[PDB]
């Protein structure tokens, strides 16, 4: 649904970086690898926690029953 708060393998708190990551792809468009590295994600577990993530809750929120 949303980004996991903690990266399963290590434990790093990767929940907060997600939004920042998106900015690094929208404004000042970097590559995904450089954007991930600039956020401090050195171990590839934290890298695959953010890179290989689907923001499904954005699609789910289109069907809110209290519009």
């Amino acid at each position: 649904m949303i980004v996991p708060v903690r990266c399963f393998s290590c434990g790093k708190v990767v929940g907060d970086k997600w939004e920042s990551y998106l900015n690094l792809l929208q404004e000042d468009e970097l590559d995904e690898g450089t954007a991930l590295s600039r956020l401090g994600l050195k171990r590839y577990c934290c890298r695959r926690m953010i890179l290989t993530h689907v923001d499904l809750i954005e699609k789910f929120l289109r069907y809110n029953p209290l519009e």
Partner: protein, 1104 residues
């Protein structure tokens, strides 16, 4: 940038899928149905007459679906999700035109509804047709939903594509087991379907039938069909081959052994043994002519004075039979894909609607005659009341036949069951793969390894890896990506086109020269003979490519029997291929640029003759190049891309061309049952059983297929940091080692949603069902059973329920056949608590209350849960170990899953190792790598990326043992692998019984799990117990712990008595009490109910 053809020709598939989606068989078939077959059946049964009142007739001028008269707008349909929630049926009204006369001879018109036809999702009639991300959102519909399935009774039912043998085609099978060959044709008309076998018995060709008596000789039927010369027979069945004439000379003398024959005499002889009955008196010769006119071959109706076409058809059947006789291996395989047709939902619904419409017309005519039978004052006003009375019948029958899957027909006397299946909702790929599925016509095919084999002729037509493993392993198949099912294009214009193309007609060629040159067969029936077959084939193909005829008309050349076949009927499986001229292709590297720009949407590619559709048969005449670099100056077709030989499901596998084939098949089987995201509206949905993933993750090693089927937008799995290493011993045979402290952080976390429906039916006695509840104990407060019920008797949303814990307190009248309300609450009977997250209350069409309560249960990856690896490496969670008791690398990464290394050397899943390396390299490089069939990210580039970051070139890091803190003496394969959690969870499979419900009949424990029942110790288990020689254990298991009954057997007449009373001797002196299984007592009573007396004779156990 310069376009490269060898790497940009693959972009045609996105265009093909945009213009012709994956679910296009159902959609196109249903659209063609509602656009053509409705009016075809209407004009067929356009008139109803009567014996009396000749000036009274009803004329169906026009028919429409969802279109009241002009209207200018499709009528308002209930949205599909509203139908799904309310348990209604998604349908649109059918409005027909009316022409009813009057005693004053005035013709008047009307437009009245005649029924409600269910509408296939995303068809030309559905509201979802051309809806874009806003209309779908407002209608609670998932944009990524496939469609093509009906919503009947609030259930998603899909009409599976049915495969069958090609109708109106000759199929000859040589049964060498006896020396018998045959030439049967299942000619299938819109009214008749019958097999005209041409067997070979006593070296003598016959012609059996379901309407004639027995084994009519072929010479007689050929004389009756017009070819009476008795020498033209030898020139039509043997030509000029000496080795064929002697074979066929045996049965040529049976037209003179009984007696010499003429055409009339042969017709009389064939009609004498006709078993067909006549409802009106007809002469034997008159009936016999009928037996040749229509009865023999329903496919060909000779409504003229010349039967040369039918005679030559029978002659060609006999020629094929004689060819098989002279030398076997010249027969045609039935399992050949080109010999099979696919019938979609459109044709089946056409048949069902035609049957229902004819029944409705018969009933309406009978009612009209009954009402008008009165001699006087036979009013015509309101003559359209019985039509609205019976309009319920047609829609009820249609909905019931679609829902139950039993298609009962009477015109053909055809009964097919299981046509419609409930749409599977486990993952997204499961729901997409249930669509575009094909079911074999064979029931079981017990030992026949023919239809269950993988025929090479299906290359590109069917998924060569996806097949229910198990008892349908070969029977059920799935369509590939590049595959288009044909439809009936034309039949009459092509005859004229052939005649223009230079083939002499069938009534202008002598039998002598009929086998001296190729004869062109149009859709199975001989049309004529044409010299220079190659020129004719080339010109016809050029005409087809330039757009003169339909793209689906397939012409090919057969040389073993000199023929130029032309096939036009629908159901043939076709795939696109790039046309290559002499030496070079036709894409020319500039049409790819235009395609990428936005023009030439794969339709101008057909119009410009760059690509064309080849079916299975036309591929026989073609030479197809796998890649552009292999084009020798003789090939006539080129593959758009070789990775389209796999279906939607098989596109999940990364690097499928490196694995062993059974691994790919197992992955195709178990990818449907992988829990994960299902739809965008998965939270606005109340289904029977939904499995959801809390944190689904896009796969690291993608595939070019999964981008097209949107599997990266609704994935079912997570990228687990796998360390392939023998660890902890709890991972011996396929068992895994899940990592605690990652499950805690959320990994494999899942959710199970289950619906419970309740209908508050109104009985005929004006009595309803009251959901009143919420009892209160002392000092207020609810009782424990009602502690989570709420004031209104429907469980509070968000609360928690356990064993007991009524959440629907439904009461029902005791006088249903109001004060006396017997309480029949709905009780949550589960082993673990679950929460109420949705309670929907509504009514159906008949205005009866309907309450659906959805219970959610959050599940944690307990020990014993099944995880797959997207390569067929299914396994169970052997042990869950803490984080510190795990290997760690220099950076402190601990693996989430520790897969045993022994899964690889005997299953050869090198594709999995390449997936691990590609995923690690891509995540280090911050990109998603591609594992696609015949291509994908090369290993060398991934290893270069891996060594650039400071890791080993082979992906094998050097770890530290987590319990001793020292180096592991071997480098450990370490990296991200996309692991998917499957639905087979131990929480739903644990089941134990001590005592409980027993069967009413035999007093034995029940069978299922919803009923607390025991485990069956059957014949094999009791034989195993016998092998050990354990007698007391056998007695205890099969009598004491299963069913023990203390019966009273009479010592004189061995019949069981009750309460120490023999009931036959009436003495009670010889009664002896002993314990036997209740099943044995039931058997004895059932034998005594027959005329069998199992008289038990007793002897003393003791006394030596």
């Amino acid at each position: 940038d310069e376009i490269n053809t060898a790497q940009d020709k693959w972009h045609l598939l996105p265009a093909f899928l945009k213009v012709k989606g994956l679910v296009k068989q159902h959609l196109d078939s249903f659209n063609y149905f509602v656009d053509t077959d409705l009016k075809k059946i209407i004009k067929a049964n356009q008139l109803i007459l009567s014996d009396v009142d000749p000036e009274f007739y009803l004329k169906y001028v026009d028919i429409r679906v969802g279109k009241k008269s002009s209207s200018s707008t499709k009528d308002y349909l209930t949205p599909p999700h509203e139908c799904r929630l309310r348990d209604m049926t998604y349908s649109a009204p059918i409005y027909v035109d009316i022409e009813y006369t009057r005693g004053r001879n005035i013709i008047m018109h009307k437009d009245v509804e005649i029924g409600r036809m269910p509408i296939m999702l995303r068809s030309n009639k559905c509201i979802l047709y051309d809806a874009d991300e806003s209309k779908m959102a407002k209608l609670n519909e998932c944009p990524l939903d496939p469609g093509g399935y009906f919503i009947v009774n609030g259930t998603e039912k899909v009409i599976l594509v049915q495969e069958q043998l090609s109708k109106n085609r000759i199929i000859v099978e040589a049964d060498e087991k006896k020396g018998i060959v045959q030439a049967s044709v299942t000619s299938s008309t819109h009214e008749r379907k019958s097999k005209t076998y041409v067997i070979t018995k006593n070296g003598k060709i016959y012609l059996k039938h379901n309407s004639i008596a027995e084994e009519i000789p072929i010479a007689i039927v050929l004389k009756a069909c017009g070819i009476l010369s008795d020498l033209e027979i030898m020139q039509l069945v043997c030509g000029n081959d000496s080795s064929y004439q002697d074979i066929f000379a045996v049965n040529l003398e049976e037209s003179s052994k009984l007696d010499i024959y003429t055409q009339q005499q042969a017709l009389e002889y064939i009609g004498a043994k006709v078993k067909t009955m006549r409802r009106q008196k007809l002469t034997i010769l008159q009936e016999g002519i009928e037996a040749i006119a229509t009865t023999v071959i329903a496919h060909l109706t000779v409504e003229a004075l010349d039967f040369r076409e039918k005679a030559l058809y029978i002659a060609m059947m006999t020629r094929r039979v004689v060819m098989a006789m002279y030398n076997p291996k010249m027969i045609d395989d039935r399992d050949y894909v080109g010999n099979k047709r696919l019938e979609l939902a459109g044709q089946l619904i056409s048949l069902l609607f035609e049957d229902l419409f004819k029944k409705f017309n018969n009933d309406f005519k009978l009612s009209i005659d009954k009402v008008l039978k009165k001699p006087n004052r036979a009013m015509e006003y309101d003559a359209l009341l019985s039509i609205n009375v019976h309009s319920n019948n047609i829609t009820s029958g249609l909905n019931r036949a679609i829902s139950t899957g039993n298609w009962s027909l009477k015109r053909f006397k055809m009964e097919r069951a299981g046509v419609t299946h409930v749409l599977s909702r486990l993952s997204y790929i499961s729901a997409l793969g249930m669509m575009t599925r094909i079911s074999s016509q064979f029931e079981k095919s017990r030992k026949v390894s023919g239809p269950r084999a993988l025929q090479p002729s299906q290359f590109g037509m069917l998924c060569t890896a996806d097949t229910p493993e198990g008892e349908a392993c070969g029977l059920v198949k799935n369509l590939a990506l590049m595959t288009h099912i044909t439809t009936d294009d034309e039949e009459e214009p092509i005859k004229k086109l052939c005649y223009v193309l230079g083939v002499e007609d069938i009534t202008l060629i002598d039998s002598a020269s009929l086998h001296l040159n190729y004869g062109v067969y149009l859709n199975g029936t001989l049309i004529g003979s044409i010299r220079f077959p190659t020129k004719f084939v080339t010109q016809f193909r050029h005409l087809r490519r330039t757009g003169k005829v339909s793209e689906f008309i397939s012409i090919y050349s057969n040389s073993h029997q000199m023929a130029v076949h032309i096939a036009t009927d629908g159901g043939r499986i076709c795939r696109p291929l790039i046309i290559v001229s002499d030496g070079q292709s036709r894409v020319k590297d500039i049409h790819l640029r235009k395609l990428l720009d936005g023009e030439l949407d794969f339709d101008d590619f057909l119009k410009l003759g760059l690509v064309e559709y080849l079916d299975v048969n036309e591929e026989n005449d073609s030479y197809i190049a796998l890649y552009e670099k292999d084009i020798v100056p003789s090939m006539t077709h080129l593959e758009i891309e070789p990775f389209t030989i796999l279906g939607a499901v098989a596109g999940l596998i990364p690097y499928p061309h490196h694995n062993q084939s059974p691994r790919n098949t197992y992955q195709c089987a178990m990818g449907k049952q992988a829990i994960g995201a299902i739809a965008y509206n998965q939270f606005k949905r109340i289904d029977t059983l939904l499995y959801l993933m809390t944190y689904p993750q896009q796969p690291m090693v993608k595939t070019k297929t999964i981008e097209l089927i949107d599997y990266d937008k609704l994935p079912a799995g997570q990228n687990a940091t796998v360390a392939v290493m023998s660890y902890s011993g709890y991972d011996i045979e396929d068992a895994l080692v899940l990592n605690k402290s990652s499950i805690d952080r959320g990994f494999g976390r899942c959710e199970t949603r289950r619906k419970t429906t309740t209908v508050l039916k109104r009985y005929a006695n004006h009595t309803q069902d009251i959901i009143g509840g919420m009892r209160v104990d002392e000092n207020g407060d609810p009782i424990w059973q009602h502690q989570s019920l709420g004031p209104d008797g429907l469980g509070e949303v968000g609360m928690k329920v356990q064993s007991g814990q009524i959440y629907i307190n439904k009461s029902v009248p005791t006088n249903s056949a109001q004060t006396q309300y017997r309480e029949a609450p709905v009780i949550y009977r589960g082993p673990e608590p679950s929460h109420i997250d949705q309670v929907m209350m509504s009514v159906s069409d008949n205005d009866q209350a309907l309450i659906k309560v959805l219970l959610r249960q959050n599940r944690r990856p307990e020990l014993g849960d099944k995880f797959s690896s997207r390569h067929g490496q299914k396994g169970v969670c052997g042990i869950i170990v803490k984080q510190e008791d795990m290997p760690f690398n220099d950076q402190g990464i601990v693996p989430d899953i520790i897969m045993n290394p022994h899964g690889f050397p005997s299953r050869m899943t090198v594709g999995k190792m390449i997936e691990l390396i590609s995923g690690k390299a891509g995540v280090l490089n911050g990109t998603l790598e591609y594992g696609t069939c015949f291509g994908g990210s090369k290993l060398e580039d991934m290893s270069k990326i891996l060594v650039d970051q400071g890791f080993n070139y082979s992906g094998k890091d050097m770890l530290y043992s987590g319990i001793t803190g020292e180096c592991l003496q071997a480098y450990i394969f370490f990296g991200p692998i996309y692991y998917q959690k499957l639905k087979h969870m131990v929480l739903d499979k644990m089941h134990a019984r001590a005592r409980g419900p027993r069967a009413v009949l035999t007093r034995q424990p029940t069978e299922g799990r919803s009923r607390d029942g025991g485990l069956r110790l059957g014949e094999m288990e009791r034989d195993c117990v016998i092998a050990y020689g354990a007698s007391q254990l056998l007695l205890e298991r099969l009598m004491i712990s299963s069913d023990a009954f203390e019966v009273d057997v009479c010592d004189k007449c061995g019949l069981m008595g009750y309460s120490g009373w023999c009931t036959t001797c009436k003495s009670a002196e010889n009664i002896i009490k002993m314990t036997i299984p209740y099943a044995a007592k039931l058997l004895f009573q059932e034998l005594l109910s027959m005329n069998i007396a199992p008289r038990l004779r007793l002897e003393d156990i003791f006394q030596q």
